[PDB]
Amino acid sequence: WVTEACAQCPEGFDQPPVILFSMDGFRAEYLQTWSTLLPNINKLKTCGLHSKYMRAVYPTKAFPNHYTIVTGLYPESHGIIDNNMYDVYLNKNFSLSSVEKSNPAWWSGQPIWLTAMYQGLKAASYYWPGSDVAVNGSFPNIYRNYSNSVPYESRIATLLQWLDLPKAERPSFYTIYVEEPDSAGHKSGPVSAGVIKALQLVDDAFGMLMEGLKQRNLHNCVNIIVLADHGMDQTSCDRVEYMTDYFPEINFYMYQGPAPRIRTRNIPQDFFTFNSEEIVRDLSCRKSDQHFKPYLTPDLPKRLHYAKNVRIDKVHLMVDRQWLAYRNKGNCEGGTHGYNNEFKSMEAIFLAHGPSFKEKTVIEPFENIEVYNLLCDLLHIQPAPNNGSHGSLNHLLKAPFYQPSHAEELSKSAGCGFTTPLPKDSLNCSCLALQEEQVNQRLNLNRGEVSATEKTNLPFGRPRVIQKNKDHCLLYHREYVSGFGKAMKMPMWSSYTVPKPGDTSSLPPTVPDCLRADVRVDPSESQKCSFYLADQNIDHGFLYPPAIKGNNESQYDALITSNLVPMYKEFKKMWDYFHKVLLIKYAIERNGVNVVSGPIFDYNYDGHFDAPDEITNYVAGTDVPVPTHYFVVLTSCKNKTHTPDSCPGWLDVLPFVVPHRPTNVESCPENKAEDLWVEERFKAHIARVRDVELLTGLDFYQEKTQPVSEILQLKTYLPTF
Ligand SMILES: CC(=O)N[C@H]1[C@@H](OP(=O)(O)OP(=O)(O)OC[C@H]2O[C@@H](n3ccc(=O)[nH]c3=O)[C@H](O)[C@@H]2O)O[C@H](CO)[C@@H](O)[C@@H]1O
Ligand SMILES: *[C@@H]1O[C@H](CO)[C@@H](O[C@@H]2O[C@H](CO)[C@@H](O)[C@H](O)[C@H]2NC(C)=O)[C@H](O)[C@H]1NC(C)=O
Ligand SMILES: *[C@@H]1O[C@H](CO)[C@@H](O[C@@H]2O[C@H](CO)[C@@H](O)[C@H](O)[C@H]2NC(C)=O)[C@H](O)[C@H]1NC(C)=O
Ligand SMILES: *[C@@H]1O[C@H](CO)[C@@H](O[C@@H]2O[C@H](CO)[C@@H](O)[C@H](O)[C@H]2NC(C)=O)[C@H](O)[C@H]1NC(C)=O
Ligand SMILES: *[C@@H]1O[C@H](CO)[C@@H](O[C@@H]2O[C@H](CO)[C@@H](O)[C@H](O)[C@H]2NC(C)=O)[C@H](O)[C@H]1NC(C)=O
Ligand SMILES: *[C@@H]1O[C@H](CO)[C@@H](O)[C@H](O)[C@H]1NC(C)=O
Ligand SMILES: [Ca+2]
Ligand SMILES: [Zn+2]
Ligand SMILES: [Zn+2]
């Protein structure tokens, strides 16, 4: 097989069997550098399909990741948030060394073997976390109780024996797990002779499987996926942070290593009463060269989706590349994993071979949460509710099983039409510059003016409202278009295409002390300038920056009540710096940039837009809700020769989900100019368009002339730097 050229199901095989092969700790880099040393995996890389890398879930550990691959769920939803965890309600400790690993109470969701079994198919497993557990009261048709020393040849032979079974007994889905190159990675690090030997050993295991399949004439019949749970990075005992250096006495329990959690020792009693906010405060900006950052789980970057679970302790530590965090100075040599999934070293491999996959294809990176829907498509079965975007992986398949469709809008735009240029209520707003209010006629756009602003500022169409009974209206202006939320008295979204900046030297500033009522929106559905007088902590901010487009006359279209959003004074410093300096820099690099911004409400930190009853903070003595986050989605043309409003091909996206916090403690900006921490803070809160979509109840790019499957690739894309 290994010498045979790049190449078909035999009698009794109506549907192609699926084999999911996991090579633990096989980082993406190992394939990029050492593939030519691995002849069997290199043939699979040459002939089959493979991604540049597959993104794992945080923490980049075995059990949360392996269970994510087979469920399509984030650890917070499937329950396995770590290898070591504590549940207060169950009052039990989970570990790989305890019998609690086999307790079905910890395992939520529906793994692929169960999905296949519930839909008339048989499933076998030669090791996989959860497969030796009675998840939802059931085990796979054939399974093996985990035994790490069983030779690879014996595991392969048993799997080939399962494929030799008669059609009635023979399973359609198979899982197989191998401990290497992870074990070698821990011993001597990712760049060692030990990992080379381990990589050659896993190549022999894959070689035995392919040769075994060739013997049965199944090598071009079986749809095989070879992947990893996470990557590997080098550790050092000179790269360890100690909690003794920050606390005089440690009375708390700590889950040590690359993804730390802090909780009380007195469990279950003090679990909820434990001052989690005190610990994060006592660890924030303590040392200038601090190699970790403390966080309360709702404050963690939203793209991680690591907060909505009792097992996820409120205190979390984000550890820097190649560093570790422990209780005391009392392992640390070689290598480990568990770090941020965005780190290059934490990236996993993904290779596919078989009749359902595209031959000799290199695909762009994607997330392991998408594998579940792909496995369902290969097995011709319906997926259970998960976090993958069904259809985003169709570009991997020769003939896709599922055809995705645009999300249907649940609420239509109504009202806010121009009637009179004279406001019925001033809303306690003042603009001494005026005077006449003839600038209100600039808000009265004709049919051709609406079409001109729709073509420029909504080039991919308006974001659709995927919310029931959401009373809203669209507001058209020469420089921007917005979707105003009537009940919350603020826009849900604001869209505008910034053209390529010329001068940049002396740009006009924002017109000060000028704010007035919007004649198009009802006074009862509008924000008042007097609302921001009573509250001292929160002030008003502009969603669309008035001075970014046009002249002085253009600024008046944005200096209205409908462009106001509740903003913390410290947050406004980041927001105004981004729109004045960073946004112009991005518009130069991208040859113009389309911007869609708006508020996010996620008080229950579940990654979904809040229902009105879920909002727990408002502008003092008003019903105006305070956003938990602010989104900024930047869209430009992939081909930089075109502007965002005249882009025929693919698009390039850069979304941000920035926490709306009263302090900038996360950036540690004491005695530091904004050019040293604002960009770093925005970059730390980069997310996918899909993340923005879930947090807002909006759907983007529905008017882009491209198939839904290609648009889903753009929506699941995570920009990296
Ligand atoms: C074995 C090992 O080096 N584990 C390290 C890893 O944990 P982690 O839990 O992520 O495990 P690894 O990815 O390193 O290796 C797989 C582990 O899962 C077990 N397994 C695998 C498959 C299966 O079906 N069933 C099963 O029980 C293996 O016995 C092994 O212990 O990162 C931690 C980071 O803080 C380290 O402290 C741990 O020492
Ligand atoms: C746990 O197993 C039960 C039983 O197999 C599943 O319940 C079935 O769900 C389907 C789809 O909703 C229904 O058509 C069946 O009538 C249900 N059967 C019973 C006995 O209730 C359940 O969905 C499984 N749960 C998970 C998370 O996989
Ligand atoms: C995996 O190990 C468990 C034991 O930990 C086995 O479960 C036992 O199976 C017998 C029947 O063969 C039952 O009478 C026992 O009550 C079970 N014990 C427990 C604790 O569940 C299981 O059969 C093993 N699986 C394989 C494939 O060997
Ligand atoms: C789960 O493991 C932890 C850590 O080993 C145990 O924590 C101890 O809990 C008691 C109170 O029940 C405290 O007084 C001790 O100080 C804790 N020890 C440590 C090392 O933190 C906990 O008891 C275990 N729970 C179960 C149910 O096994
Ligand atoms: C990831 O997918 C899961 C499953 O669809 C989502 O969790 C469900 O959320 C609803 C409430 O919106 C609950 O009624 C279900 O019980 C949850 N199911 C499970 C298995 O937990 C989850 O919200 C999704 N996550 C994101 C961020 O979209
Ligand atoms: C970019 O667009 C121009 C036309 O404006 C075209 O000639 C060029 O080939 C495109 N570049 C790529 C990489 O497709
Ligand atoms: Ca929510
Ligand atoms: Zn692993
Ligand atoms: Zn490991």
XYZ file of N, CA, C and O in Angstrom, residues 102-169:
272
model
N -16.070 6.606 35.183
C -17.069 5.692 34.624
C -18.512 6.046 35.022
O -19.450 5.427 34.510
N -18.688 7.037 35.926
C -20.003 7.497 36.379
C -20.684 8.292 35.245
O -20.146 9.318 34.818
N -21.856 7.823 34.742
C -22.523 8.523 33.625
C -23.042 9.933 33.919
O -23.350 10.662 32.974
N -23.127 10.321 35.210
C -23.601 11.635 35.665
C -22.758 12.814 35.144
O -23.292 13.910 34.963
N -21.456 12.580 34.893
C -20.520 13.593 34.391
C -20.614 13.814 32.875
O -20.212 14.873 32.393
N -21.097 12.808 32.125
C -21.131 12.826 30.664
C -22.470 13.282 30.069
O -23.431 12.509 30.013
N -22.513 14.544 29.603
C -23.692 15.144 28.968
C -23.587 15.045 27.439
O -22.573 14.582 26.918
N -24.642 15.456 26.741
C -24.696 15.412 25.285
C -24.884 14.021 24.714
O -25.197 13.076 25.444
N -24.695 13.890 23.396
C -24.868 12.626 22.688
C -23.664 12.294 21.785
O -23.584 12.810 20.666
N -22.735 11.412 22.231
C -21.606 11.038 21.359
C -22.055 10.304 20.092
O -23.114 9.671 20.085
N -21.259 10.428 19.016
C -21.514 9.892 17.673
C -21.921 8.395 17.676
O -22.823 8.035 16.918
N -21.300 7.549 18.533
C -21.663 6.131 18.613
C -23.136 5.952 18.994
O -23.824 5.168 18.344
N -23.641 6.751 19.968
C -25.051 6.733 20.384
C -25.965 7.231 19.258
O -26.985 6.599 18.998
N -25.576 8.330 18.569
C -26.307 8.933 17.443
C -26.500 7.910 16.315
O -27.590 7.826 15.747
N -25.443 7.125 16.019
C -25.452 6.065 15.012
C -26.362 4.914 15.455
O -27.174 4.442 14.657
N -26.251 4.497 16.741
C -27.041 3.413 17.339
C -28.532 3.719 17.423
O -29.346 2.825 17.183
N -28.893 4.977 17.741
C -30.286 5.414 17.833
C -30.945 5.502 16.445
O -32.173 5.567 16.360
N -30.133 5.498 15.365
C -30.617 5.615 13.988
C -30.335 4.362 13.113
O -30.159 4.473 11.896
N -30.361 3.187 13.746
C -30.221 1.886 13.094
C -28.850 1.425 12.639
O -28.766 0.511 11.816
N -27.768 2.019 13.166
C -26.407 1.608 12.803
C -25.669 1.014 13.997
O -26.008 1.315 15.140
N -24.668 0.164 13.737
C -23.863 -0.426 14.804
C -22.539 0.324 14.941
O -22.010 0.815 13.943
N -22.038 0.475 16.181
C -20.799 1.205 16.444
C -19.826 0.443 17.339
O -20.225 -0.099 18.372
N -18.543 0.411 16.934
C -17.466 -0.253 17.672
C -16.417 0.748 18.139
O -16.271 1.815 17.542
N -15.682 0.408 19.205
C -14.678 1.310 19.751
C -13.496 0.590 20.382
O -13.673 -0.203 21.310
N -12.287 0.865 19.874
C -11.070 0.350 20.477
C -10.374 1.547 21.096
O -9.447 2.118 20.514
N -10.886 1.950 22.271
C -10.482 3.101 23.085
C -10.944 4.429 22.503
O -10.804 4.680 21.303
N -11.500 5.268 23.386
C -11.962 6.643 23.188
C -12.606 7.116 24.483
O -13.492 6.427 24.992
N -12.185 8.274 25.043
C -12.815 8.761 26.283
C -14.339 8.854 26.159
O -14.852 9.487 25.234
N -15.034 8.138 27.042
C -16.492 8.069 27.064
C -17.078 6.784 26.509
O -18.205 6.425 26.864
N -16.326 6.083 25.627
C -16.770 4.829 24.998
C -16.769 3.621 25.950
O -17.452 2.632 25.683
N -16.008 3.705 27.057
C -15.968 2.667 28.085
C -16.821 3.110 29.291
O -16.666 2.598 30.401
N -17.741 4.068 29.037
C -18.686 4.659 29.992
C -20.101 4.475 29.414
O -20.294 4.628 28.205
N -21.083 4.152 30.274
C -22.476 3.975 29.867
C -23.180 5.343 29.749
O -24.075 5.660 30.539
N -22.754 6.155 28.753
C -23.300 7.494 28.470
C -24.770 7.347 28.071
O -25.080 6.586 27.149
N -25.671 8.035 28.814
C -27.133 8.004 28.642
C -27.698 6.561 28.769
O -28.668 6.195 28.102
N -27.062 5.771 29.637
C -27.424 4.388 29.924
C -26.991 3.354 28.902
O -27.414 2.199 28.995
N -26.142 3.741 27.927
C -25.689 2.824 26.880
C -24.215 2.935 26.509
O -23.632 4.019 26.543
N -23.631 1.790 26.129
C -22.254 1.619 25.663
C -22.306 1.376 24.139
O -23.354 0.937 23.654
N -21.195 1.542 23.367
C -21.239 1.168 21.938
C -21.409 -0.351 21.798
O -21.098 -1.077 22.750
N -21.909 -0.833 20.634
C -22.133 -2.265 20.362
C -20.949 -3.143 20.782
O -21.150 -4.182 21.415
N -19.720 -2.709 20.443
C -18.466 -3.364 20.821
C -17.536 -2.275 21.371
O -17.351 -1.241 20.732
N -16.983 -2.495 22.565
C -16.070 -1.548 23.198
C -14.974 -2.278 23.979
O -15.111 -3.465 24.286
N -13.893 -1.560 24.296
C -12.779 -2.098 25.064
C -12.530 -1.214 26.271
O -12.475 0.009 26.130
N -12.417 -1.827 27.463
C -12.103 -1.108 28.696
C -10.647 -0.685 28.573
O -9.797 -1.511 28.228
N -10.381 0.617 28.761
C -9.066 1.223 28.561
C -7.920 0.494 29.265
O -7.978 0.230 30.467
N -6.893 0.158 28.464
C -5.664 -0.545 28.835
C -4.566 0.036 27.911
O -4.447 -0.367 26.750
N -3.813 1.033 28.421
C -2.801 1.803 27.686
C -1.584 1.024 27.146
O -0.910 1.529 26.245
N -1.278 -0.163 27.693
C -0.098 -0.907 27.254
C -0.357 -1.962 26.164
O 0.606 -2.571 25.685
N -1.630 -2.154 25.745
C -1.975 -3.120 24.693
C -1.275 -2.708 23.375
O -1.501 -1.590 22.905
N -0.362 -3.562 22.829
C 0.363 -3.195 21.595
C -0.539 -2.741 20.458
O -1.608 -3.321 20.255
N -0.117 -1.673 19.746
C -0.848 -1.054 18.629
C -1.335 -2.062 17.593
O -2.468 -1.943 17.135
N -0.500 -3.076 17.266
C -0.814 -4.152 16.318
C -2.062 -4.921 16.747
O -2.905 -5.222 15.900
N -2.181 -5.220 18.058
C -3.314 -5.942 18.643
C -4.618 -5.143 18.548
O -5.671 -5.736 18.319
N -4.542 -3.804 18.704
C -5.689 -2.886 18.615
C -6.221 -2.869 17.177
O -7.432 -2.958 16.961
N -5.290 -2.766 16.202
C -5.552 -2.744 14.763
C -6.185 -4.083 14.327
O -7.207 -4.070 13.634
N -5.585 -5.225 14.753
C -6.040 -6.585 14.440
C -7.483 -6.845 14.878
O -8.242 -7.443 14.116
N -7.859 -6.381 16.089
C -9.212 -6.513 16.644
C -10.200 -5.682 15.815
O -11.318 -6.137 15.573
N -9.777 -4.475 15.376
C -10.591 -3.577 14.553
C -10.846 -4.199 13.177
O -11.977 -4.137 12.689
N -9.807 -4.821 12.572
C -9.908 -5.505 11.275
C -10.817 -6.730 11.394
O -11.551 -7.040 10.457
N -10.789 -7.393 12.571
C -11.619 -8.547 12.931
C -13.100 -8.108 12.999
O -13.974 -8.869 12.583
N -13.366 -6.872 13.494
C -14.711 -6.284 13.574
C -15.256 -5.976 12.174
O -16.464 -6.070 11.953
N -14.358 -5.615 11.234
C -14.690 -5.337 9.834
C -14.915 -6.640 9.049
O -15.496 -6.605 7.964
N -14.448 -7.781 9.601
C -14.590 -9.122 9.028
C -15.906 -9.787 9.457
O -16.288 -10.812 8.881
N -16.598 -9.198 10.462
C -17.881 -9.677 10.993
C -18.981 -9.662 9.918
O -18.923 -8.807 9.026
N -20.009 -10.551 9.992
C -21.086 -10.504 8.983
C -21.892 -9.208 9.072
O -22.019 -8.643 10.162
N -22.413 -8.736 7.920
C -23.174 -7.491 7.729
C -24.146 -7.130 8.867
O -24.212 -5.964 9.250
N -24.889 -8.122 9.397
C -25.859 -7.937 10.481
C -25.211 -7.537 11.812
O -25.811 -6.777 12.572
N -23.992 -8.046 12.086
C -23.227 -7.775 13.310
C -22.225 -6.631 13.135
O -21.915 -5.940 14.106
